Amino acid sequence: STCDDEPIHIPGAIQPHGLLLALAADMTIVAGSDNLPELTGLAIGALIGRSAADVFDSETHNRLTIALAEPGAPIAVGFTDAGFVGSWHRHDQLVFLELEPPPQAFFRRTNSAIRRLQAAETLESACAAAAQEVREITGFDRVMIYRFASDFSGEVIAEDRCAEVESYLGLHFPASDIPAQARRLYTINPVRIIPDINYRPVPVTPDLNPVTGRPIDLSFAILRSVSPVHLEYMRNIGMHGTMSISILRGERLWGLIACHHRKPNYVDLDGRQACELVAQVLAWQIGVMEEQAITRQTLKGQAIQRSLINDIEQLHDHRAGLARNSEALLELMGASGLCLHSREGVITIGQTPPGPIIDQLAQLAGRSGGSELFQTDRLSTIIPEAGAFAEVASGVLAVPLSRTPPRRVMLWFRPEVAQTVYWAGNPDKSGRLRPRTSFAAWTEQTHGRAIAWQPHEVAAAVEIRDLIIDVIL
Amino acid sequence: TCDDEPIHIPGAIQPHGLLLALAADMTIVAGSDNLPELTIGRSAADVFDSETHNRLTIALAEPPIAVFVGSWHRHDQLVFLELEPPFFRRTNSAIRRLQAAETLESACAAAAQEVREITGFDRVMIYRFASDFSGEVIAEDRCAEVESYLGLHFPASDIPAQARRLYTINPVRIIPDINYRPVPVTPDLNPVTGRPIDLSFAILRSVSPVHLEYMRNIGMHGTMSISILRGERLWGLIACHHRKPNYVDLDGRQACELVAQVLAWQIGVMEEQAITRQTLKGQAIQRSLINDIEQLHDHRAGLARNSEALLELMGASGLCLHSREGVITIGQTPPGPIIDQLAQLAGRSGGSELFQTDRLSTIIPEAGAFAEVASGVLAVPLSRTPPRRVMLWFRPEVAQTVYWAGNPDKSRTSFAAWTEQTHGRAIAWQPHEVAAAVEIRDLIIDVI
Numbered sequence: 001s002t003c004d005d006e007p008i009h010i011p012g013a014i015q016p017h018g019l020l021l022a023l024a025a026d027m028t029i030v031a032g033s034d035n036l037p038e039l040t041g042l043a044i045g046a047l048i049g050r051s052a053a054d055v056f057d058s059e060t061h062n063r064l065t066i067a068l069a070e071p072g073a074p075i076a077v078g079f080t081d082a083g084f085v086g087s088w089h090r091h092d093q094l095v096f097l098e099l100e101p102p103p104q105a106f107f108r109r110t111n112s113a114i115r116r117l118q119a120a121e122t123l124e125s126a127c128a129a130a131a132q133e134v135r136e137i138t139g140f141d142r143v144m145i146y147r148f149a150s151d152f153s154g155e156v157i158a159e160d161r162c163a164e165v166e167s168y169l170g171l172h173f174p175a176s177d178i179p180a181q182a183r184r185l186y187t188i189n190p191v192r193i194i195p196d197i198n199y200r201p202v203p204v205t206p207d208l209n210p211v212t213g214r215p216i217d218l219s220f221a222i223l224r225s226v227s228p229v230h231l232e233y234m235r236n237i238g239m240h241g242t243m244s245i246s247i248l249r250g251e252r253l254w255g256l257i258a259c260h261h262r263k264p265n266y267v268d269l270d271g272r273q274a275c276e277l278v279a280q281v282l283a284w285q286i287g288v289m290e291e292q293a294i295t296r297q298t299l300k301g302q303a304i305q306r307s308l309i310n311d312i313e314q315l316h317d318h319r320a321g322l323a324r325n326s327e328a329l330l331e332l333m334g335a336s337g338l339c340l341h342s343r344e345g346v347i348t349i350g351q352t353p354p355g356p357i358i359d360q361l362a363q364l365a366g367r368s369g370g371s372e373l374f375q376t377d378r379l380s381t382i383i384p385e386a387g388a389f390a391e392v393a394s395g396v397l398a399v400p401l402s403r404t405p406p407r408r409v410m411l412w413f414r415p416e417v418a419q420t421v422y423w424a425g426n427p428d429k430s431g432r433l434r435p436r437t438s439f440a441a442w443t444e445q446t447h448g449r450a451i452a453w454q455p456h457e458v459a460a461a462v463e464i465r466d467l468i469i470d471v472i473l
Numbered sequence: 474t475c476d477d478e479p480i481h482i483p484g485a486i487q488p489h490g491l492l493l494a495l496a497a498d499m500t501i502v503a504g505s506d507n508l509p510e511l512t513i514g515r516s517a518a519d520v521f522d523s524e525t526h527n528r529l530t531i532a533l534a535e536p537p538i539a540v541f542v543g544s545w546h547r548h549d550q551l552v553f554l555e556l557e558p559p560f561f562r563r564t565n566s567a568i569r570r571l572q573a574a575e576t577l578e579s580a581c582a583a584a585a586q587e588v589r590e591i592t593g594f595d596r597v598m599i600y601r602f603a604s605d606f607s608g609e610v611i612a613e614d615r616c617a618e619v620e621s622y623l624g625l626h627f628p629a630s631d632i633p634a635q636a637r638r639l640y641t642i643n644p645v646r647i648i649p650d651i652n653y654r655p656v657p658v659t660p661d662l663n664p665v666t667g668r669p670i671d672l673s674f675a676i677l678r679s680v681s682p683v684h685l686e687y688m689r690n691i692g693m694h695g696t697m698s699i700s701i702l703r704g705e706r707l708w709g710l711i712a713c714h715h716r717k718p719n720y721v722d723l724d725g726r727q728a729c730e731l732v733a734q735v736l737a738w739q740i741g742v743m744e745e746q747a748i749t750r751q752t753l754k755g756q757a758i759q760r761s762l763i764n765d766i767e768q769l770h771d772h773r774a775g776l777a778r779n780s781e782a783l784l785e786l787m788g789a790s791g792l793c794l795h796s797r798e799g800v801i802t803i804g805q806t807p808p809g810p811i812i813d814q815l816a817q818l819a820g821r822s823g824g825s826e827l828f829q830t831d832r833l834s835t836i837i838p839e840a841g842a843f844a845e846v847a848s849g850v851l852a853v854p855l856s857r858t859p860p861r862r863v864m865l866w867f868r869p870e871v872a873q874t875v876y877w878a879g880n881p882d883k884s885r886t887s888f889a890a891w892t893e894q895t896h897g898r899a900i901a902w903q904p905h906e907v908a909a910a911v912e913i914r915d916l917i918i919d920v921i
């Protein structure tokens with residue numbers, strides 16, 4: 001898995017659709033797109049050292065001098081008197097600059113759909129809304145949204161695509177289809193467009209940082225050359241025009257708007273400017289629906305909680321009370337059974353496994369990770385011998401009642417479900433490395449897996465311990 | 474009597490635009506007296522011709538618009554419709570900036586900055602409410618030569634009680650000329666619910682003359698605000714200003730608002746990463762005097778041994794332990810309305826959330842005599858109402874000098890810079906102290 005090793009930020013080339021300049025403080029252009037000879041008469045070794053204004057208009061000269069002042073795109077490079085597009089940044093310690101060819105109606109489209117994501121009630125009503133709008137404005141034949149799992153494997157959770165375009169919906173993808181580095185930068189470079197995938201790269205000459213002992217960091221490059229492997233990837237997939245957007249909830253890369261096209265296709269700055277905003281608007285709503293659900297589960301835990309308050313007020317042992325209310329509260333968070341583990345007293349309510357519940361789970365419990373909690377959807381995975389009791393103990397939820405010794409333990413159990421997940425692949429079949437040739441959906445049925453706990457169910461158990469405590473006074 | 478003037482059924486609108494009220498299965502009933510003139514109760518299909526009525530009616534019937542400019546809404550059960558006389562990279566690039574802004578101040582002076590470049594307004598100030606709902610202009614972006622109101626406090630009265638629920642529910646407002654002569658609505662009879670015309674989501678609505686009095690005073694004749702909503706509670710306001718009158722068209726004023734929503738989350742971003750950047754430093758010395766209190770044969774010998782340490786945690790002038798039976802004081806002590814007038818003050822309208830206050834003579838008036846030890850107070854419930862054993866830390870009074878736009882004594886006249894020396898006020902709390910306290914009681918609970 002050298003996938004996580006290939007240095008992608010220094011491809012030593014940019015793409016042909018634009019041309020690029022790297023400049024120091026006083027606009028000595030350091031490096032250059034090797035198609036810049038076709039731009040000012042000067043082959044690259046002659047551009048080097050030269051000053052910036054001469055290249056340019058007198059209009060476009062001054063207007064970049066002022067944008068550089070503040071210690072952010074887009075200026076226009078009309079330079080001589082045609083019109084170019086000026087995206088820039090500072091990086092390393094020199095200023096980069098990439099160049100691109102050439103109101104209201106575009107913009108009403110945006111808020112009509114900004115405000116649409118605002119009304120979306122479910123993630124799915126939101127994401128077939130997200131993906132939909134990204135498509136009505138980037139025109140791509142296919143606009144999919146990709147969820148990341150814990151592993152950084154993924155799943156198409158929504159999709160919007162023009163008819164005749166074959167569908168990759170509900171499909172899982174390996175954690176390898178985006179390796180470590182790509183994610184480390186897509187967390188910080190939130191956007192990428194590659195418009196032709198058999199593009200011939202236009203190198204930069206030189207590949208040297210005059211600033212430091214380095215090749216050219218092309219991190220904040222929208223023009224940077226990408227891996228040939230991810231290209232073989234996309235000829236395989238049969239989509240020759242592609243674009244992504246990183247969807248970030250709080251500096252953890254959450255998922256991706258990956259758009260696709262059968263033929264090549266170009267999105268201008270404004271077009272993918274709006275698009276950054278869509279992933280931004282949606283990273284918001286995902287956090288709202290996330291948190292407005294935590295209040296509607298905190299909602300129906302009302303009627304059934306008050307039940308076991310009257311039941312510990314009357315019985316004055318809680319275990320006798322709560323375990324009476326057991327037939328509903330374990331369906332509340334859809335648990336199969338639970339058990340209460342006091343190191344003196346273990347009382348198992350409903351469905352539960354024996355004597356390695358105690359030691360092999362409570363010594364497994366919090367690790368005195370004070371602010372932490374323990375769970376799995378698979379338990380045969382972590383205590384392999386639980387494989388035997390996987391039928392009643394496949395997944396688990398558990399809550400401490402104290403700084404360890406006291407090691408008071410509550411735990412919810414979930415049984416094994418035969419679920420079917422499907423993917424393109426062959427996630428085992430993932431000289432150089434090589435990308436897959438076929439992406440037809442194969443289905444896997446899963447042994448030993450619980451249904452996924454969500455904070456939605458977690459908030460339930462979370463609330464329970466916080467009341468048992470209130471009563472104990 | 475400030476919280477009493479009914480502004481929402483003012484029975485009039487502003488002259489620059491004109492508006493009509495119609496009966497829902499569409500026929501038009503009650504008319505604004507600003508529109509009859511240059512163009513009584515009628516049937517409704519009767520609009521421009523089928524183009525702007527029908528395609529626009531079907532869009533409003535089933536589920537903005539262009540006709541003049543056609544904004545609408547449904548309210549107190551009838552159909553509204555307002556009319557006013559008749560870029561994008563800027564908007565996103567300021568989200569993109571509003572997202573990278575590192576501190577609360579860089580969040581607001583970015584906020585303040587775009588809203589100016591998109592209304593051209595002479596002054597775009599950002600106005601945070603403190604708890605009492607007095608306020609302070611915390612950041613500002615402005616055209617030169619125009620007087621600067623930054624770091625300035627204002628009365629809570631400059632926007633009264635009712636006015637606020639409205640900015641809590643109608644999130645935006647513009648009046649372009651403040652000496653508009655109000656052109657009435659006729660009638661101001663709701664034909665549906667038979668009482669005056671609720672003009673709540675009317676953006677053309679006639680505004681209060683009291684606040685008109687305001688802007689002739691201040692000398693700014695073109696103004697617009699946007700209210701900032703963090704979770705259904707009015708947190709603050711983008712108050713924009715202009716020396717002359719000025720109109721911002723509709724799509725132009727939609728962009729202004731969206732910025733405040735971005736900041737309503739962006740502030741919520743800051744709200745929560747300072748909330749965890751403190752719990753760290755934080756643990757390291759805390760966990761120490763937990764084990765030194767966790768020398769519990771029982772706790773006072775444990776706690777009060779290291780209390781002289783845990784007291785330094787929160788600017789604890791004194792604290793108290795309040796169980797209905799056992800009240801234990803660490804440090805400087807208030808005596809008998811500690812028990813009764815604070816723990817009943819505590820969980821009543823507890824609202825599941827805690828009580829903290831900087832002022833006590835304002836919340837229990839007799840605390841005035843004890844300002845030297847009790848001017849501000851914090852308390853945490855142990856939780857059910859009651860026994861509700863409540864712990865509480867307090868703070869003495871600090872002499873700060875606060876600045877105001879003119880004296881805080883009202884009708885108002887002029888708002889030049891004057892100083893008040895503020896007595897009986899304690900110095901504040903944000904969670905590096907509040908989160909401390911929360912974590913602290915969590916410890917005490919884990920203890921018994």
Ligand SMILES: */C=C/C1=C(C)C(=O)N/C1=C\C1=NC(=C\c2[nH]c(/C=C3\NC(=O)C(C=C)=C3C)c(C)c2CCC(=O)O)/C(CCC(=O)O)=C1C
Binds near residue numbers: 182256
């Ligand atoms: C082991 C090497 C790789 C395999 C196998 C593979 O599939 N990808 C490998 C490395 C890289 N991928 C790069 C970019 C990239 N990968 C994806 C993955 C998907 N694209 C899709 O459309 C879907 C699903 C519908 C998936 C799962 C994406 C989206 C991207 C970004 C570009 C785009 O939008 O298509 C990559 C980085 C190249 C670079 O930009 O430097 C590498 C190294």
Ligand SMILES: */C=C/C1=C(C)C(=O)N/C1=C\C1=NC(=C\c2[nH]c(/C=C3\NC(=O)C(C=C)=C3C)c(C)c2CCC(=O)O)/C(CCC(=O)O)=C1C
Binds near residue numbers: 646697698712885
């Ligand atoms: C208690 C009555 C009032 C006093 C006293 C007063 O000074 N004004 C009073 C009444 C109203 N104010 C209304 C709206 C309003 N008020 C403010 C106050 C400020 N403007 C500023 O620029 C700053 C600070 C820099 C402050 C504190 C604002 C911003 C607004 C909203 C409109 C605007 O942008 O100016 C108001 C409502 C009138 C209506 O809607 O009919 C009333 C009654």
